[PDB]
Amino acid sequence: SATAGSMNAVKDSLQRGQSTIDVALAAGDTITDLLGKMKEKALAASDTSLNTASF
Amino acid sequence: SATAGSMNAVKDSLQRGQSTIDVALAAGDTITDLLGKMKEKALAASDTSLNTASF
Numbered sequence: 001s002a003t004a005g006s007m008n009a010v011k012d013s014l015q016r017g018q019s020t021i022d023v024a025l026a027a028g029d030t031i032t033d034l035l036g037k038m039k040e041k042a043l044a045a046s047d048t049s050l051n052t053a054s055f
Numbered sequence: 056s057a058t059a060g061s062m063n064a065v066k067d068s069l070q071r072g073q074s075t076i077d078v079a080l081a082a083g084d085t086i087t088d089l090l091g092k093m094k095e096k097a098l099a100a101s102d103t104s105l106n107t108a109s110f
Contacts, residue, residue, distance in 0.1 A: 036057040044064040049071050 045055055100110055 032057070036060055039057065040061050040064050043061050044067065047068045047071070049068070049075060 044050070099105070
């Protein structure tokens with residue numbers, strides 16, 4: 001019975017891990033969007049028809 | 056998806072190239088007209104019946 005009761009702490013810990021990963025995935029959404037925009041900037045800046053102000 | 060989104064920069068660059076060539080073709084209209092008039096001047100000046108003032 002004491003062993004079954006200690007599984008509540010195991011469940012709390014696993015739920016804590018799922019919450020931590022959820023926050024990481026939200027930040028990762030932000031970061032992959034930023035990286036896509038950054039690739040769009042670098043791709044545009046490699047064109048040589050740009051003037052200096054656009055670059 | 057990030058690859059599809061970066062095609063917008065490719066399209067911007069190709070449109071920029073079409074604009075650059077358009078300006079060159081407008082200047083080329085001017086220049087071919089000038090060269091035709093210049094050939095008309097040289098052709099008239101090669102006639103030896105011209106007096107010095109007309110030449």
